[PDB]
């Protein structure tokens, strides 16, 4: 144990975004209801100068059937950021998950992935790319003046698949062209001022890192205007090692790319939740102290790499809301709690908060 | 002697604020008449991108009797800053000096500090906190869109007093609650965008440093939204040592606090003015050269700590106006002159100017 | 050979200005036609956040006869920068080249440099300084709200001339007073917010460096409001050595001066073009790899000196347009091609691009 400053309320504790003002933005993923929850709204105004929609801007949320755009939840998050002078990230224009099946049906209502006529396959490819372009055109035309950071594609690399290309219907139907078109359409509709990212997880693992590096070079060679890599950084206390994170950021920086940490959380367990504690009160202090040392190591690394990192965004606000609790229950027969942030479920600061707010 | 660049006019000499553009703001304390004095106004526009009122915004200046707000002098300083794109600091919402006695009278016209009925003392405490809240509400509502930096309380720690709490009437009547309320009211009226400081002098001395650190932690534990510490830095050529200054800034940074240097001057004498020179022309060059080396050491330290220091403000413009001349005369039987700045009384640069403007 | 990343199109390659966002602006010299050439305009929007007129704002371009101001070409460049949020530099208010002869004729139509009556010479000096003041007044009044960076005088030092002062008609008629007046008039018309530079080439050579340093100190002693030195940096692969560049920047920083690199190019040849290659396709890869290592060394030096350098501007966009091709032909009997940029004549990135865009 090394962090023994008091567990004060986070609502008025010194601002995390302030601490990192000349390093990178400090962001949080939010749901629309949190923009009007008193404590969550206060937490955002106190600690965060960047916001991303955890779920409200995924493809199925915004265009659940063709041409039927659903803007209300997304507008709510954008308006909260505008009211409070926060930057925004867009999650996400393209993803194999959270994508409605109408994209991948031919004009006949049948799955394009089953088509065997080569000329018809080329027509389906053209049609799917037009649908993708229209999804992007609508969303970027609406938000381009307010959202500067765009996860144009998400999780398109899978090292277990041939050539490293995740074999989603996107890839089955268009190869890598859906990725090329996604970036071109985003630039066409949004102009030079928006920053376009390829977002993925385990970006430091090999050979996934090579595959992402290879893909970006291939896209660059095709004239694709990519600006950066987003690193989800869903990490644990021990994995991955900090030196591998450092080499990954430097590596993509060598292609001229900006880097953002997009979905940061530090689980208390391994991958998978080998044994979750059942309740929050059951987590011993030693675990939070271990998590504090890990957060310290991460953020001091981010400071060293500050000229290659424009933003660090957490995948949530406080420990009362995190996607890791679904996984904790799942692998522990219905009961389990994770604690991945620097703010606890009662909106108090954790040892990890003091570890990243201090002078180093 | 080490600084032999010419003693050019400061009016058009290279800008001090420019030199520190990516480190911290460079500020000066001013009186309203100096916003319309040709040479002082030019000096501010040339060298400073932050302004503070030396006297015009103290409690007795702004609310000399209850509810009788006097805005003219303060408005003048704020308008000069706005015309010239300068940031502002507010000195100061609460101070045991420069505070009119009406605050501390019960509704009966008698000193609250003399009251012996416990229930009546609690009523006086409530009344004094309401008067404090109204003073802050009026001032912050008026200036919140123009002043980002607020000395919410000033000089509230005194190591000679029990528990380190300066035993002013504020503390005699309310304990530390006046400090809690001062910060809460300032945040309530001004929003999250204004930065709230506790300002004091000798912040590197022990045990004063501990007492300030202890008090801030206690206020943080009560939910108080403090953002930073202001260090007056009324220093001499030899005191305090630079390593103690460094440890102080780092120490408060460890609580997540920003730091500003708020009232910087480097006296030519010890504490007290053991022997002032009678006139400015009597000061030998060796003294200015010693003062230059001291200013060099201070500002190179500030550069090293730049990510913990947002602003460095001098307690005046040029050597023709400084509060240290009152003290120089006082302790030298009516005659005496100090020279605490980098600009001399004829608006020429001093060796100290060249020492902090150069490449290091 | 060390840089083997692909020679992708530069039009959508990761942004150079983005890479240097927290170091200095990245600029390019342009001609008006390039603001409407599809590829040049795209290159500026992709890679550059600062623009300078290669020729359209020289004295003869803007005021070819007395009082006959020609604004169209200059306005075009300023409007392109404004549309795209780019900063601007002004090249240049005073220069011995590109200056129409009407400046230097007495009211009698005869060359002021030939006048032998001392009282008449003082009248011509006064008249030439009034004409200079009016040229500057007109240009600064028109553009002061849009152009922050002003090359007030250009190439006024010549180490082969007595006292180091280039013996142009400006100096023959007014001594150094034309320089004093140029800076004062620019400040008078433009205010404190515009930054005023003395621009020259070979600024690291001795004794030219001493002469510039000496002149600036003399101007500072006369009350002249100079803010910075512009270093043209028309360099080769081997000259000048990087340590001499470093000492030059530090040296002028010691006078409190900002520094900008104003006309950067890295010729493939010596001075003069000892042997140009006849055509672009004749340049071997080894030369581009040598040029890449040189650009790497320069920009890593600029990063180290980032707090003394506000902007780095290239004297052109891509290798299809550069003034060095006139000199390559000249000294090679009509045929010759240089390649001084990081972007090639077909708007593809060069090894030098990868060398300055990477993580270091
Ligand atoms: Na730095
Ligand atoms: Na989720
Ligand atoms: Na005073
Ligand atoms: Na030219």
Numbering used by the authors:
A (entry chain A), B (entry chain A), C (entry chain A): 5 to 364
Direct quotes from the study:
We then selected the eight most active designs and two natural GH10 enzymes for quantitative kinetic analysis with the chromogenic substrate 4-nitrophenyl β-xylobioside (O-PNPX2). The active designs spanned five orders of magnitude in catalytic efficiency. For instance, the most active GH10 design xyl3.1 and the least active one xyl8.3 exhibited OPNPX2 hydrolysis efficiencies of 9417 and 0.61 M-1 s-1, respectively. To understand what were the underlying structural reasons for this vast difference in efficiency, we determined their crystallographic structures. In both structures, the two catalytic Glu residues were positioned as in the design conception (<0.5 Å all-atom root-mean-square deviation (rmsd)). By contrast, the low-activity design xyl8.3 showed conformational changes in the residues that form the active-site hydrogen-bond network (2 Å all-atom rmsd). Furthermore, missing electron density in β-α loops 7 and 8 suggested that at least parts of the active-site pocket were mobile, although design accuracy was high throughout the segments of the design model and experimental structure that could be aligned (0.9 Å backbone rmsd). We, therefore, concluded that accurate positioning of the two catalytic Glu residues was crucial to obtain any level of activity, and that high levels of activity depended on atomic precision and preorganization in a large network of polar residues that surround the catalytic residues.
GH10 enzymes hydrolyze the β-1,4 glycosidic bonds linking the xyloside units that comprise the backbone of the polysaccharide xylan, which is second only to cellulose in abundance in the plant cell wall; xylanases are, therefore, essential for biomass degradation. The design method is inspired by the evolution of new enzymes in nature through recombination, insertion, deletion, and mutation. It starts by computationally segmenting all structures belonging to a modular enzyme family along structurally conserved sites and assembling the resulting modular fragments to generate a huge combinatorial diversity of backbones. Instead of using the natural sequences of the fragments, as in natural evolution or laboratory genetic recombination, we next design the sequence of the entire protein (>300 amino acids) to maximize compatibility between the fragments and stabilize the active-site geometry.
